[PDB]
Amino acid sequence: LTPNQVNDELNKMQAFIRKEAEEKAKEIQLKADQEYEIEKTNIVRNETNNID
């Protein structure tokens, strides 16, 4: 029934709302280059094997 608890709750909810999106974007940006590098290596390996 106090405004300071709602202001502190919104002030924590904003930082948690930003930290969740940053925590997801760091994971997706961490995995995407490794997956693209793995597929880019495998396709070149299969193409070199077919060429030989």
């Binding site: 502190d8 002030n11 969740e20 925590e23």
Partner: protein, 392 residues
Amino acid sequence: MATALYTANDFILISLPQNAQPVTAPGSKTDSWFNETLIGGRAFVSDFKIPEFKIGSLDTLIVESEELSKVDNQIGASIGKIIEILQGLNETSTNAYRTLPINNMPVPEYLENFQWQTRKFKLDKSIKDLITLISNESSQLDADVRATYANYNSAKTNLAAAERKKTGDLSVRSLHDIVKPEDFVLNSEHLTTVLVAVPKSLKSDFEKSYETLSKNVVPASASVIAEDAEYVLFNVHLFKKNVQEFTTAAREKKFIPREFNYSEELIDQLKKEHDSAASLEQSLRVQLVRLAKTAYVDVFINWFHIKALRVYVESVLRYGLPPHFNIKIIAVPPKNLSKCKSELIDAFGFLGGNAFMKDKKGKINKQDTSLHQYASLVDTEYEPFVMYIINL
């Protein structure tokens, strides 16, 4: 409070941000407010901060907080079970193993120097696998001491079963420790051995009626070869066919007949069973003492690391922004946690909110429901900041 706390000091784990201040001292640090503004001026503050772990989202932090609270309660019950198992052996009194140095260092010095140091843990992995591995290691350590105590109870039950065959009332006991080659002859089918248990008052009636008790008896056998606390043991030699008439006259005489046969394997197995049960219980107690001590130490270290990780996860989940906070452990004296809990809760109660703060002191636990634990999955007490009650 605690089931294993007799004369041990109490500690309160509190967590707050690095930019917070109390309500009874504006413009002062929390360390100076805890040291100087403490109740009675004897409040001891120690470092309890640890390194931050990788967090993916709040959904994994809520499940890690609930699993950290359930693993903290299971580790707290497993520490009290190993403490009660070690106290039941008579190896630790009510003023030892609760107020002495554990891990080769004191509780305040080891708790102040606890900076997330482990020998099987890492700082780059998930905290859920470390908390589940610590809870599984503490549960296996308590289960090993419980299995050793159950094996010691089975060895004590085997020794108590061998104690009834070793001596006592002549109803199930057989003579296997006072047998000789001059009182029981079983080398031929003509003569045999029959035991007759008679009372102290009926000794003259059994000695006088021993010749008329059955036909084909051996005289001069009325002697006290064994003695009990409710009857006397006598030896009588006769044929196998006269055992029915001697047992019928012994049952009609109000005597107690004993069925015994001359055999060395029965006395050898009867003595070897009591010797193997006594050696098995004697080895099981010595193994259960060291297993209970090592399981108590590993359950204490795993309970401390699980309590620090649960306090950091509860402070990070309850606090939100910023990600870093000031987490420390305050050492309080015995019978003084109510004033420090009411002063710390009243001073730090305005940080969370004015509608969720209430006056409370100490830690009151119950058998129907453990209160004052700060559970995030079950119904319990809640405060504006992170507050944990630990009773040693």
